[model samples]
Target: LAAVSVDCSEYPKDACTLEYRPLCGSDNKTYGNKCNFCNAVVESNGTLTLSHFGKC
Candidate 1:
């Protein structure tokens, strides 16, 4: 699985803030959003990936 980090400061305070969510993959596997969450369920089980979106 892959993990990603996002900067919430760029987003509006009312807008969709980055938070950890549960995403299930094939075979009923459970994977939590490890990027934003300081305490992740699966520790060190993902690769860190980054990307920027929107305009300044």
Candidate 2:
């Protein structure tokens, strides 16, 4: 599978499944108040991770 980087603008307006869950990305920044944490994981092509909660 091709890898895709998480483009902040590309983040969904809403989570694919659940409510907006604040998550810290590997880059030490918030992914969204939009898409949920796990969605961010997918957005990163499974290469990156939702590192933790709150502001990283």
Candidate 3:
């Protein structure tokens, strides 16, 4: 499957309530929340992408 990249800057200067909408990242790790997933993406500077919307 094609990986979808996340850009948190799309909603900069904001807050995430933190939900359990877990996602699998390109790093082959599961982030408990979407925010964490996006953060990982941002930190990787587009290197990391989302594999799916669920726990890995």
Candidate 4:
């Protein structure tokens, strides 16, 4: 199993962002986002946790 984490706060909210194309994994899986692709998982409702540096 593989997992990936990203820091969304690292980029400006109004700034342009790069487009991430969905990729197929070796196990015949397709991911919706780069994080999923990196993590090699399809469902985002698992044991993943989120952390932010500042309060919203």
Full-model lDDT for every candidate: 0.32, 0.53, 0.68, 0.38
Q: Please write out the lDDT profile of model 2 over residues 12-50, one tens digit for every residue.
A: 445363455455766775754435544555566645554
Best prediction by lDDT: 3
Among residues 3 or more apart in sequence or in different chains, the pairs in candidate 4 whose N, CA or C atoms overlap within 3 Å are: none
Reference-based TM-score, model 3: 0.69
Which ten-residue region of model 1 has the weakest summed lDDT? 47-56
Better of 2 and 3 by lDDT: 3
**lDDT of each residue in 1-56, candidate 1, tens digit only:** 34444433322233332654554332333434423321222222432223322211
Per-residue lDDT tens digits for candidate 3, residues 1-56, read 66554446553225674457777886787987767766676677746768777787
Could you tell me the lDDT of residue 4 within candidate 3? 59
Q: How would you encode candidate 4's per-residue C-alpha lDDT over 1-56 as one tens digit per residue? A: 33434443332233433665454444445545445443433233233333211111
User: Which residue pairs show collisions in model 2?
Assistant: none
Report lDDT (Cα) of residue 56, candidate 4.
Answer: 14
Q: Which 10 consecutive residues of model 3 have the lowest summed lDDT?
A: 5-14
What is the TM-score (0 to 1) of candidate 4?
Answer: 0.32
Query: Model 3: how far is 36 from its true place, Å?
Result: 0.5
Show the lowest summed lDDT stretch of 10 residues, model 4: 47-56
Candidate 3 segments exceeding 4 Å error? 2-14
Full ranking by TM-score: 3, 2, 4, 1
